[PDB]
């Protein structure tokens, strides 16, 4: 699986490490 | 020119606002500025 003009991408609450831990 | 400071800049009429840094990307001699995939300026060759 594969700058800002007013946009912003908020990071997910659960990081990929935490999702892998789950 | 001022680097690492958010300053309105005017290079050859670019009139863009942002912060300036030394860029590792290379430019061809005739090219004067670069654009992003979204048609927004992201690099400027200094005319002076």
């Amino acid at each position: 699986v594969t700058k800002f003009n007013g946009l912003t991408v908020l990071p997910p609450l659960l990081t990929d490490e935490m999702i892998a831990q789950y | 020119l001022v680097k690492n400071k958010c300053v309105n800049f005017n290079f050859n009429g670019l009139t863009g606002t942002g912060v300036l840094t030394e860029s590792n990307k290379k430019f061809l001699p005739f090219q004067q500025f670069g654009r992003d995939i979204a048609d927004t300026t992201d690099a400027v060759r200094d005319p002076q």
Binding site: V1, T2, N5, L7 | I37, A38, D39
Partner: protein
């Protein structure tokens, strides 16, 4: 026999995921769709209206 079959099935799943490029179709499609929506929204500024 069942343990060997399960291990072979897991290995085959790994090999198919590694080889077939379009396996992650749904996630790739959702990411591409969201990126395209954002790109068209950004390009919408150049519109004269």
């Amino acid at each position: 026999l069942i343990a060997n079959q399960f291990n072979s099935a897991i290995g085959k799943i790994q090999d198919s995921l590694s080889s077939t490029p379009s396996a992650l179709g749904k996630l790739q499609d959702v990411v591409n769709q969201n990126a395209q929506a954002l790109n068209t929204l950004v390009k919408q500024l150049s519109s004269n209206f």
